[PDB]
Amino acid sequence: STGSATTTPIDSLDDAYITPVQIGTPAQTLNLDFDTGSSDLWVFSSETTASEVDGQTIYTPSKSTTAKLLSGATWSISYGDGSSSSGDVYTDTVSVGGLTVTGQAVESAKKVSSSFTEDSTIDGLLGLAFSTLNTVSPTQQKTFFDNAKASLDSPVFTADLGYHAPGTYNFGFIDTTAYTGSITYTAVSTKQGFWEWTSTGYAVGSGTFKSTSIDGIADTGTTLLYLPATVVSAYWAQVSGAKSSSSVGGYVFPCSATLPSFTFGVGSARIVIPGDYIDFGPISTGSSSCFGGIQSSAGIGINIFGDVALKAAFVVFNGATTPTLGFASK
């Protein structure tokens, strides 16, 4: 089998991407944030504290004839950005772009933190990291991809995120029309439960490529590109007036600037992030200070190849017996 779904930016800045997902019988369609940095499929629901729902579409398991309460199971997750959610668990039928999993764990939120409530466009998350990170207790549950894998034509999914435009998540096949050149594959460590790999270096604008190993995660659920302070300083040094602002919480730059590109290495291959991808707009409405899309990972504890990086590429998440990651230009 295969599946194919369009993923759409939630706003004009590409702050995140939502993909429609069918849950239950009859189908209840929710718009979920596909997140290769976590491993829980959780949704706003009829069980979510009413004051914490503000415009999201909810899953109502009592209206699904295939929903079953997973007895005694709870979940609770805290994300790197400080947000969190928790609740109980159903199994139900979940379909993405034509691909169907029966008996998928659907984690129903009883509580969500303020940032989730405040974002009316995201009805939940669909985790696509390794199932070892899944928070369900006392019996850990598998991700949608893990459940589908054996049925897929090929045990892979691909992320093709758009810049200020829709893109595609495909399951079970590689669309050879969706990228240019070849796909360069690179090793993955699953030891921390992430799609963790090592970039071979970087360049700023038309500058020379610096060969240096950068360990990080391919994370569709993180907006920005988080890299070591040395790298980030080298980038922003090429932008007149850019500075790290403690009060704002990262590098800011004059909105009048034209940003240089940023290149990262995948083996001997090179992915070029155009400068415009690195502009996240005014820090506050009406400001002429703009927020940068490349930020320091110091104090995160891990480098993160988030959407800023991934959207410059066609990305293969290869779930073969030994997982690997593939990147192509597009």
Swiss-Prot record:
GO terms for biological process: proteolysis. Residues 17-328 form the Peptidase A1 domain. The chain holds residues 90 to 419 of 419 of the full protein. It comes from the Eukaryota. This is Endothiapepsin. Disulfide bonds join C255-C290. It catalyses: Hydrolysis of proteins with specificity similar to that of pepsin A, prefers hydrophobic residues at P1 and P1', but does not cleave 14-Ala-|-Leu-15 in the B chain of insulin or Z-Glu-Tyr. Clots milk. Belongs to the peptidase A1 family. Its EC number is 3.4.23.22.
